[PDB]
Design a protein around this ligand. Structure first.
Ligand SMILES: [Zn+2]
Length: 666
RNA sequence: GGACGUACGUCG
RNA sequence: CGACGUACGUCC
């Protein structure tokens, strides 16, 4: 209530009737600005004619919040305020929704699918297209697809009333720009992709913005890595033994990847072992009986090496016992879903050194200095103020549980309560109830950002130009810190240049707000034009579909799974097997997180039906009334019967063959 | 199942 | 400048 001067002036160009890229770093400010803009838009229409606005919410929580906010704001107006989503798109057709409501709030993908298949022949039905967080307008984004559908009708000479763009954001972003020239080029490209002429930033009332902006102070706490790593040495010896054992089956193991000398525990060995896996998945022998065992042994060795590398990576950022508990949980999970002579030997090799690793993990002298520095900087702040509701940001999801267990099992800090929050990638109610009780948790160990904190700790975290600003984080301003822990000087340089890029944009927008909107347009129109030109020139024609009958086999077992002639495409994205010989080739299991996506309902998970393979094949759903399995070519190999050469595809779009549509008749 | 984005890393 | 790997997140 009582719109302040800063948020009244920030919405002036949008109310004047211009497409704006309003940039407000507040949470409530953007919401109130959007509400005032929708009010001034739906109130400036004459008698008879009625307006129609759409608020493009990107996330389900943001959509559910904005729908309730709009419903509570426009209650004494007679304005229909509804909303579409992934669960409501089934019934209540979107055409009748838009033709009977004045304020629609839908996650874009719905409008993209509508504009694509059958619905919304043109966006001229809308009169306002408020894009929440327009900075996400990038390559192949749903916002970008909506803007492409808009720019096609705009530049194609189609006479029609085009809707306005009121794109709200908190940071226009810089991307990979090096200088102010490249920053201005990127900002102009974003303006052309959004078809706007004003970038509204608060200039007159700076004190009202600085009162609540949530601008904390940075504090770099770079620490050196561990010197005496006995756990790392033992795991490296185990990895060397595993590689020496795997070399006995595949002679040219070093000649399968073009990667140079690599070190254990780095991100390079992971790519090297993944390349070795993808080069061993095409191993073919004329016996076709020994290959099914050779490829299986190689897959098991590669999986063990990948788990060892993941344990070595977790050990560098967490306790020495957490990386061992990870391997113990992995071995416990794998010791039930099949046990052959190779997996038993690997388990025995691991158990021969588990006893030795337990002593080194329990030894408190081998504690990494990074967690010591973290506890040291946490205690000095919680002693100064025993009310700091801090938030911790890490990179890996497996490190969230590690930091939670570290906070739990530490006698130095007792006043801390774990606030583990990873994301679905968990569920929506689990994500909502954990953020609700945040006024009795003390620390929130999250991995990716209504969170008004006063202390942030980026424990080995790096990202875009800014990974700290919270769009929906208005709250209040009373002094906060942005502590950054790291061990790789590279990251420290990244964070040193990001704060520069910030000022870069601060000068770029200031240089762009001086140009008279005329020339601005005279440029951005040419830019978007060129863009459409590239969209028309760059178009790979559909290659001749290979009309043979090849056989899709297992990924790790090389068993005859199914035939390509039995593959049916449901909706150009899902592929099922319409056969009777394939139903006995897989086993079903209950799904951990069942859900539905606009056409199906995830019921079960289908795995390989072999003796000790148990490879993840795909899901099993019910299309409309009948239940079919949806497989993923990613977990499949493609062997031809004519030539015999095998191929590995990651996505279905890369697979060029006779895509027979799914006929419900058979 | 699929699409999309961001970060890191390897390659020619 | 292109492909590719992984991690994380979002949506349908
Ligand atoms: Zn198999």
């Amino acid at each position: 209530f009582k719109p302040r001067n800063y948020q009244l002036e920030l919405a002036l160009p949008a109310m004047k009737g211009k497409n704006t890229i309003i940039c407000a770093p507040t949470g409530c400010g953007k919401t109130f600005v959007s509400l005032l803009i929708c009010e001034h838009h739906l109130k400036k229409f004459p008698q008879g004619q009625k307006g129609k606005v759409v608020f493009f919410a990107n996330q389900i929580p943001v959509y559910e919040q904005q729908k309730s906010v709009f419903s509570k704001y426009f209650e004494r107006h007679g304005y229909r305020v509804t909303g579409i989503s992934g669960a409501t798109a089934e019934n209540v057709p979107v055409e009748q929704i838009v033709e009977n409501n004045d304020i629609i709030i839908l996650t874009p993908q719905i409008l993209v699918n509508n504009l694509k298949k059958g619905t919304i022949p043109s966006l001229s039905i809308f009169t306002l297209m408020i894009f929440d967080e327009c900075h996400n307008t990038s390559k192949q984004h749903p916002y970008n697809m909506i803007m492409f559908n808009y720019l096609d009708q705009k530049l194609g000479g189609s006479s029609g009333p085009l809707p306005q763009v009121i794109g709200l954001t908190a940071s226009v972003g810089v991307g990979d720009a090096k200088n102010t020239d490249e920053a201005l080029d990127y900002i102009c490209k974003l303006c052309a992709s959004l078809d706007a002429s004003v970038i509204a930033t608060v200039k007159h009332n700076l004190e009202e913005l600085e009162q609540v902006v949530y601008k904390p102070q940075k504090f770099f706490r770079k620490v050196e890595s561990r010197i005496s790593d006995k756990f790392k040495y033992i795991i490296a010896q185990l990895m060397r033994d595993t590689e020496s054992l795997a070399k006995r089956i595949c002679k040219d193991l070093e000649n399968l990847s073009q990667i140079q000398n690599r070190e254990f525990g780095t991100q390079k060995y992971e790519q090297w072992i993944v390349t070795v896996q993808k080069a061993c998945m095409v191993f073919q022998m004329p016996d076709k009986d020994e290959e099914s065992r050779i490829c299986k042994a190689l897959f098991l060795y590669t999986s063990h090496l990948r788990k060892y590398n993941d344990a070595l990576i977790i050990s560098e950022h967490a306790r020495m016992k957490d990386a061992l508990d990870y391997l113990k949980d992995f071995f416990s999970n794998v010791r039930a879903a099949g046990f052959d002579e190779i997996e038993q030997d690997l388990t025995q090799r691991f158990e021969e050194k588990l006893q030795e690793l337990e002593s080194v993990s329990r030894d408190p002298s081998n504690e990494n200095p990074k967690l010591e520095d973290l506890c040291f900087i946490l205690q000095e702040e919680y002693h100064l103020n025993p009310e700091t509701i801090t938030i911790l940001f890490v990179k890996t999801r497996a490190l969230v549980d590690a930091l939670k267990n570290w906070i739990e099992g530490n006698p130095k800090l007792s006043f801390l309560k774990p606030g583990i929050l990873t994301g679905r990638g968990m569920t929506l109610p689990a994500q909502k109830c954990i953020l609700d009780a945040f006024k009795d948790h003390n620390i929130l160990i999250a991995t990716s950002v209504i969170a008004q904190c006063n202390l942030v700790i980026l424990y080995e975290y790096v990202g875009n130009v800014i990974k700290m600003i919270q769009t929906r984080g208005r709250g209040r301003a009373r002094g906060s810190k942005c502590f950054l822990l790291t061990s790789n000087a590279g990251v420290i340089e990244k964070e040193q240049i990001n704060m520069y890029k910030e000022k870069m944009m601060n000068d770029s927008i200031l240089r762009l707000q001086t140009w008279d909107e005329a020339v601005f347009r005279e440029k951005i129109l040419h830019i978007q034009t060129h863009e459409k030109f590239i969209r028309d020139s760059q178009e790979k024609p559909k290659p001749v579909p290979d009309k043979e009958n090849k056989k899709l086999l297992c990924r790790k077992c090389k068993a005859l799974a199914c035939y390509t002639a039995d593959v049916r495409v449901i909706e150009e994205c899902h592929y099922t097997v319409l056969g009777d010989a394939f139903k006995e080739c897989f086993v079903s299991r209950p799904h951990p997180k069942p859900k539905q996506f606009s056409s199906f309902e995830k019921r079960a998970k289908i795995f390989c039906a072999r003796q000790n393979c148990s490879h993840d094949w795909g899901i099993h759903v019910k299309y409309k009334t009948f239940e079919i399995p949806v497989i993923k070519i990613e977990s499949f190999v493609v062997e031809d019967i004519a030539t015999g050469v095998q191929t590995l595809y990651s996505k279905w779009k890369d697979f060029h063959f006779e895509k027979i549509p799914f006929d419900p008749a058979e």
